[PDB]
Amino acid sequence: ATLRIAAMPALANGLLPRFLAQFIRDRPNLQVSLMGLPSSMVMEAVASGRADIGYADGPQERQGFLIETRSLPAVVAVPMGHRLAGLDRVTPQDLAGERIIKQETGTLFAMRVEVAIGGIQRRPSIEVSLSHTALSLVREGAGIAIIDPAAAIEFTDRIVLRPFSIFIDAEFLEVRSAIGAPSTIVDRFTTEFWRFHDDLMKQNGLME
Amino acid sequence: ATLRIAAMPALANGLLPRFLAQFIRDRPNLQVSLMGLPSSMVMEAVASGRADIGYADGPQERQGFLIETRSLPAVVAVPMGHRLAGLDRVTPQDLAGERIIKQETGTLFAMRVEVAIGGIQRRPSIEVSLSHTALSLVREGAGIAIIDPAAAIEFTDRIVLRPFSIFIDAEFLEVRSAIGAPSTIVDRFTTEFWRFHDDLMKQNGLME
Ligand SMILES: C[C@@H](N[C@@H](CCCNC(=N)N)C(=O)O)C(=O)O
Ligand SMILES: C[C@@H](N[C@@H](CCCNC(=N)N)C(=O)O)C(=O)O
């Protein structure tokens, strides 16, 4: 038995290996691989057959793929003790004067954020590409970030997460080859991962 | 003022943003970017000028680059409470029967590990490409990992690190363009990052 998974770091760093450790605990003869790649390379892995399952940021070219989706609101991550931690939610103008940690310029997620805060004076920001970099900077008191909740979950013991007043789609995809035969093991992983993902998001106030 | 950095996730996830948050705390007008990329893409970023500084796994093609180095022994990461946590050091045969979390097949680091344990019976392993995935799996009790200490440092509160009896080179590179004019800001970052990296490694028993 062999299972090969490819995912972006947002999930490959924290959520997916937490799940994988549950999945395999009683499958001692299941050979597994879990590759952290950029989403673009996640797709190329699934298409070339180098990976059975892919997890990638949305959106992607869906041609040769079977694609399941999750959309969740992005959350605001702020350092412990920040003025904003004492709020029910965070609006664009609450961010005025703050150093904002931004995702990478030109990505769909980054532009959604940038559009939601088009009404505030732009200060010098920090640009990153990994959600985990942003969350580490938040933890260090360097600024605040609007991020996908999947990554944020690994930091809830050391930063504060608050809902944003504006819905910013933080979508990722579970990706399969459109070409292929049924796979019991793949159907099981994907299915249980959703249950596991949905449980965590709902139990932390990040999903309906 | 603008600073652009590209690094592999092993450093871009944890160490580099910890440092960046110190570097910028009193530079409110310094525009910074910190991109997590695969090492191969880290080099392409530095060569094309899309990044001023690169941090990448060793080794790389050194042609158009100025390259500074750190080599440190890889450490063994084991779950809290593991039998091996009670040892001064871990040898190859101490790993017999353990589920080993391996780096990606065919990489120089992965083959160094695999060579150091050629004398043990091979059991089904878990293959990953990010050190943070491996360390998360260790934390979950899924197995043990031989990893670069740079990444391991972000987990010392939740796993146990022990020296390996065999020296496995865990090298990374600070990378600059061979083409260019002096840069005060780049010289400062790199210099202080080394001081910061060296401090942490020495203060955690991971460097001489
Ligand atoms: C860089 C990488 N994605 C980020 C997350 C990007 C923001 N999240 C999102 N769009 N859902 C990561 O894995 O940390 C990618 O290009 O795949
Ligand atoms: C996948 C990525 N490097 C790993 C670390 C690989 C093992 N460490 C090492 N060889 N020093 C990471 O960033 O987690 C790279 O290809 O750049």
SS3 content of chain A, % helix, strand, coil (to 5): 35, 25, 35
A148/B9 Cα distance (integer angstroms) = 18
Terminal CA-CA length for chain A = 35
Q: Are B114 and B139 in contact (CB under 8 A)?
A: no
> Is A158 touching B (CB cutoff 8 A)?
no
**For residue A197, how many other CB atoms are within 10 A of its CB?**
22
Backbone φ and ψ for A183, nearest 5 degrees, come out as -140, 110
- When CB atoms are compared, the residue of B9, B29, B137 closest to A17 is B137
- Atom 4 (ligand 2) nearest CA: B130
Resolution (A): 2.3
Amino acid letter, A123: R
For the sheet containing B126-128, what is the strand order? Answer: A65-73, A169-177, A53-57, A2-7, A31-36, B126-128, B100-102, B144-147, B75-79, B159-163
Cα(A9) to centroid of ligand 1, in Å? 7
Q: Are B38 and B140 in contact (CB under 8 A)?
A: no
Closest by CA to B150, choosing from B55, B64, B34, is B55
Burial call B159-176: b when 16+ CB within 10 Å, e when fewer = bbbbbbebebebbbbbbb
Cα(B139) to centroid of ligand 1, in Å? 23
Chain B closest-CA separation from residue A192 CA (Å) = 17
Encoded tokens for A155? 């930091």
Q: Which residues pair with B66 in a beta bridge?
A: B176
Q: How was this structure determined?
A: X-ray
**For residue A189, what are the CA distances in angstroms to A51, A53, A96, B191?**
13, 9, 43, 46
**For residue B76, how many other CB atoms are within 10 A of its CB?**
28
Encoded tokens for B104? 């990606």
CB-CB under 8 Å, A136 with B104: no
Q: Which residues pair with B161 in a beta bridge?
A: B77
Closest by CA to B158, choosing from B179, B182, B133, B141, is B141
CB-CB under 8 Å, A25 with B124: no
B25/A123 Cα distance (integer angstroms) = 15
Terminal CA-CA length for chain B = 35
Q: How many helices (H) and strands (E) does chain B have?
A: 7, 10
Q: Supply the DSSP symbol for A133.
A: H
CB-CB under 8 Å, B29 with A124: yes
Domain spans of chain A? 1-73+169-203, 74-168
Q: Supply the DSSP symbol for A165.
A: S
Q: Are B96 and B84 in contact (CB under 8 A)?
A: no
Q: Supply the DSSP symbol for A87.
A: S
**For residue B68, how many other CB atoms are within 10 A of its CB?**
12
B145/B100 Cα distance (integer angstroms) = 6
